[PDB]
Amino acid sequence: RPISTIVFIVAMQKEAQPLINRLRLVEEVNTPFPKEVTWIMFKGMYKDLNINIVCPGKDSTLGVESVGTVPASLVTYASILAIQPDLIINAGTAGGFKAKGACISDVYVVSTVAFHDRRIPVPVLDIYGVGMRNTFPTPNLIKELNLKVGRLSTGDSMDMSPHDEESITANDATVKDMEGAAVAYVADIFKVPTILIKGVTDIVDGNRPTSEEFLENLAAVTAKLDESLTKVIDFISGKCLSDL
Amino acid sequence: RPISTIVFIVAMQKEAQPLINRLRLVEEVNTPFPKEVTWIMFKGMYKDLNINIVCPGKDSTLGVESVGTVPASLVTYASILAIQPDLIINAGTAGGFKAKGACISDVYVVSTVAFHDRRIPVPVLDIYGVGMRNTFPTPNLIKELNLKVGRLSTGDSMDMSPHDEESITANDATVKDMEGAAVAYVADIFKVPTILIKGVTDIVDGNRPTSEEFLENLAAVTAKLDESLTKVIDFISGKCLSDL
Numbered sequence: 001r002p003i004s005t006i007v008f009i010v011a012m013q014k015e016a017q018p019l020i021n022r023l024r025l026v027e028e029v030n031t032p033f034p035k036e037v038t039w040i041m042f043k044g045m046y047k048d049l050n051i052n053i054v055c056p057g058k059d060s061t062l063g064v065e066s067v068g069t070v071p072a073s074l075v076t077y078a079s080i081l082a083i084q085p086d087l088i089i090n091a092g093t094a095g096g097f098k099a100k101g102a103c104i105s106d107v108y109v110v111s112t113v114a115f116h117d118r119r120i121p122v123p124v125l126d127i128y129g130v131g132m133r134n135t136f137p138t139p140n141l142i143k144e145l146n147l148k149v150g151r152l153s154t155g156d157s158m159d160m161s162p163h164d165e166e167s168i169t170a171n172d173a174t175v176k177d178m179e180g181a182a183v184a185y186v187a188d189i190f191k192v193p194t195i196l197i198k199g200v201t202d203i204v205d206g207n208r209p210t211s212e213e214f215l216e217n218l219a220a221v222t223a224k225l226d227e228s229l230t231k232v233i234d235f236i237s238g239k240c241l242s243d244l
Numbered sequence: 245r246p247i248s249t250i251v252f253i254v255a256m257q258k259e260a261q262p263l264i265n266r267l268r269l270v271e272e273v274n275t276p277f278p279k280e281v282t283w284i285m286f287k288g289m290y291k292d293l294n295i296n297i298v299c300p301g302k303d304s305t306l307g308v309e310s311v312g313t314v315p316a317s318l319v320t321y322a323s324i325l326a327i328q329p330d331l332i333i334n335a336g337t338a339g340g341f342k343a344k345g346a347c348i349s350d351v352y353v354v355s356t357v358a359f360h361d362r363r364i365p366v367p368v369l370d371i372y373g374v375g376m377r378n379t380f381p382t383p384n385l386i387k388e389l390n391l392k393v394g395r396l397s398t399g400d401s402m403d404m405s406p407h408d409e410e411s412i413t414a415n416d417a418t419v420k421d422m423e424g425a426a427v428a429y430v431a432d433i434f435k436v437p438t439i440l441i442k443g444v445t446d447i448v449d450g451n452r453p454t455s456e457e458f459l460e461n462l463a464a465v466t467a468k469l470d471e472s473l474t475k476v477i478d479f480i481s482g483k484c485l486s487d488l
């Protein structure tokens with residue numbers, strides 16, 4: 001049976017904006033979420049697909065985007081149970097490692113993702129900590145659209161301690177972010193097809209810092225990312241979860 | 245109006261076991277959760293209180309308890325929405341800092357909790373990262389039962405990098421754990437009264453003993469913790485959210 005509905009999970013609404021504009025998605029007023037959360041949702045029908053972009057929104061106290069693994073998981077759970085999707089995709093900008101060939105503005109399709117900041121020095125619990133997992137296999141996509149593939153490492157810090165560096169290295173990650181691994185975990189319990197797409201905005205093992213290189217590009221890349229997601233939606237439209 | 249229902253959130257079922265026994269709580273078979281999660285629930289009626297202990301259970305892949313901020317938040321959300329409690333309490337063992345006077349087996353009542361492993365080097369986002377917050381004020385409890393009070397720092401790692409150490413220091417934490425901050429976040433969105441109780445099983449600033457603090461003490465303290473929670477339940481029974 002063909003894919004009908006696709007739920008997009010984005011940490012920052014800024015990252016999704018362009019897509020929302022090109023597809024002319026409308027922000028759902030009555031969200032199927034609890035009256036108390038700050039989550040926002042944008043629904044739309046592109047060709048034969050019900051596209052839904054859900055974002056954790058802005059923190060009710062600080063007024064800043066609620067990034068991180070905790071809000072990312074809560075949202076992914078709620079969305080799954082609510083607008084039960086056929087395919088859930090986690091997109092957003094990220095850190096790249098040039099050592100693994102990551103240029104700025106590159107658009108990778110995460111293959112396997114794990115946690116680099118959950119170090120539990122215990123026999124089996126340390127594997128749980130890393131909690132590594134696969135993404136839904138989409139060879140025709142990476143092939144057709146000819147995209148870059150790589151592993152993702154997730155952590156609640158935007159910086160990178162020497163401890164994070166060693167683990168990201170043990171994960172063999174090419175891209176680095178703050179929520180991917182968390183999303184994959186939830187969708188995995190409800191066993192729903194999942195895809196993670198990351199736009200490189202900052203070269204972590206590079207010279208230029210991790211905070212200023214990120215800002216002067218969260219426009220240039222956030223743009224390239226959009227252009228890319230569209231063509232991805234465009235590719236799925238009409239297919240079955242296996243034709244991907 | 246008096247407190248009617250109390251939901252306990254515990255990372256490990258081992259930690260709660262004793263309490264479950266003394267109160268003779270029964271494990272709910274039909275949990276109000278999705279058929280796919282591995283969460284377990286124990287319900288019971290102690291005096292005039294509907295006590296519910298909810299645990300994320302054991303990982304479906306690794307078979308180890310699903311500790312950490314992600315499972316702790318998911319569970320806290322689901323329970324709130326499900327068995328809508330009047331008071332939610334987060335109990336469990338933790339790391340203590342003797343520098344702040346924390347002896348092994350001590351039983352503190354967290355005053356303020358924050359994250360020590362979500363370092364985001366950005367203007368307002370770094371405050372979000374720490375995401376510090378207060379616990380429900382219970383002076384009569386700490387007064388009557390004469391308990392130890394202290395701040396809690398939360399992080400997804402059981403070890404402690406030099407980076408975690410500096411932040412736990414900036415949080416002025418006396419106790420250290422892996423879920424508290426996450427629980428307080430969820431309950432705070434639904435604005436429900438919340439309490440965090442931690443049993444010190446390991447002195448972080450010490451020598452990290454033998455097969456004691458890591459193995460024995462988790463029995464010796466998990467015991468003292470139980471004895472303590474009971475007397476806490478016992479104190480609340482009959483009171484209003486303001487009499488605590």
Ligand SMILES: Nc1ncnc2[nH]cnc12
Nearest residue numbers: 094095158176177178202
């Ligand atoms: N270097 C980085 N680490 C984590 N998340 C990021 N998002 C953008 N750049 C990042």
Ligand SMILES: Nc1ncnc2[nH]cnc12
Nearest residue numbers: 337338339402420421446
């Ligand atoms: N040292 C420690 N750090 C974090 N969580 C703990 N739980 C028990 N001991 C701990």
